[PDB]
Amino acid sequence: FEHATTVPNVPGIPYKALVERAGYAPLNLEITVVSSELTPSTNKEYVTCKFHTVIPSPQVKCCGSLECKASSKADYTCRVFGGVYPFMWGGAQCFCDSENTQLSEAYVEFAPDCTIDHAVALKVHTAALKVGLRIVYGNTTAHLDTFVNGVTPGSSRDLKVIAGPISAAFSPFDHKVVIRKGLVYNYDFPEYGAMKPGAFGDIQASSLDATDIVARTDIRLLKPSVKNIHVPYTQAVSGYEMWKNNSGRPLQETAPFGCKIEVEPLRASNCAYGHIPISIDIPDAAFVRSSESPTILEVSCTVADCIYSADFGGSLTLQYKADREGHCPVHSHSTTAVLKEATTHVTAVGSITLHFSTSSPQANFIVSLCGKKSTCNAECKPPADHIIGEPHKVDQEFQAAVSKTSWNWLLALFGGASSLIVVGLIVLVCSSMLINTRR
Amino acid sequence: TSRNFSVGREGLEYVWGNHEPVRVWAQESAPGDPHGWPHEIIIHYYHRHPVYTVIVLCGVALAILVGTASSAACIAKARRDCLTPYALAPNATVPTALAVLCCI
DSSP, X not given: OEEEEEXXXXXXXXXXXXXXXXXXXXXXXXXXXXXXXXXEEEEEEEEEOOEEEEOOOOEEOSXXXXXXXXXXXXXXXXXXXXXXXXXXXXXXXXXXXXXXXXXXXXXXXXXXXXXXXXXXXXXXXXXXXXXXXXXXXXXXXXXXXXXXXXXXXXXXXXXXXXXXXXXXXXXXXXSEEEEETTEEEEOOOOOSSOOOTTSSOSEEBSSTTOSOOEEOOOOEEOOOOSSSSOOOEXXXXXXXXXXXXXXXXXXXXXXXXXXXXXXXXXXXXXXXXXXXXXXXXXXXXXXXXXXXXXXXXXXXXXXXXXXXXXXXXXXXXXXXXXXXXXXXXXXEOSTTEEESOOBOOOOSEEEEEEOEEEOSSEEOOEEEETTEEEEOOEEOBOOSOSEESSOOSSXXXXXXXXXXXXXXXXXXXXXXXXXXXXXXXXXXXXXXXXXXXXX | OOOOOOOOSSOEEEOOTTSOOEEEEEOOOOSSOTTSXXXXXXXXXXXXXXXXXXXXXXXXXXXXXXXXXXXXXXXXXXXXXXXXXHTTSSSOXXXXXXXXXXXX
């Protein structure tokens, strides 16, 4: 036996409904959402950290000449210089006093502490959604997890269920994402190979222990002034350090719809947006045919005071004369007023109090007990407090957001003017007819 | 010091120091009364949709006025095309019940 409903996507808020099988006693149903997840598909571009400039020991040739080769290390640089005559602690180091060339080298590596301080660059794609539900029907409970796509069947062996699709597409992730020690940022980094000095991504590699590293750090070599021995150089600042000074705040403090951002793997947890349709198939043994339930004989709805707030601010009491003993359920029928109980215990003559919540300035709904209907009506005062710590349970539509007193005013004044013109017009056709009578 | 923030029907979340997050939601406690006189119906709904009331409450209170202006106009229409044809009998007499409106 099938049944289809819509469910709002907000955790920790039950949604109630009643399935009316033609042949048996009605059946209660409650659907709560316990946890949701949103997980995209990713792939890695490179890793980045601070660099370490290594400068080897220079080589000198006394009175010959040298020239430079080419190698594969990261940002290699080389230069040759003229007649120098250099000095160490023991004294002068060559024997021809000019024509004394000297060679200089430089390149970059990874600092030894980068195994804890690094970043990863990622590209992201379409997202998926996956939920965990709690379902009560009759006198049994069940848990399960499904994919909200539209086709994939659900879970365990007793209850068929299929969800999807979602009524809104939303992802908090942009097309390019950075990750550092558990914080997630929305950045736009250069590609693999488009290095430029002084910005993020001036040194790049595919892993922390690889052997092929590329870089561009704008290093240039100068000529020695004082004659002891050394090699001078100048360089730009590391883009990693400059980015850490202007990072901004992470994504754990900007995501809309109030989401939780967690890594390993990348996911957004417990968001609240849009509506979800659900079809469900119920086993046949859980229906109990009508000849066993109680049968009631009269009912009347008396309503006590009420408030329209975000918590349970009302009351009512019914009056029944049953025929047997049983446990038939109750239910509200209007989409602006929700109940709190599910079933009751019944006897010959008695009463029962139930609690509800509402979002309309007057209560005008119908209540069904054991299958029998009754109407309730009164007026509802506006709330006292200003701020509370709960979420609202029902939405708010334009129709029943205006009182009935206001409707009496707006109607009679409006239609009063229109009713004045129709009598103002029939007199004319009368007049003409009288003028036609005048001829 | 002290700082001021505004909340709506969806909510707000604030974090202070090394503590845990805290969440708050808003309600519908505006002055007036939706059951008293028309005098105090307006102050209620106006506050509730304030930036909308410059569309939504001033909208509906306005269309009220145009209806009663356009209506009382087109009733004078009927007086024109019916009073004038009456007196189109010069040197004659009519029922007084209508002979009282032809003079004005």
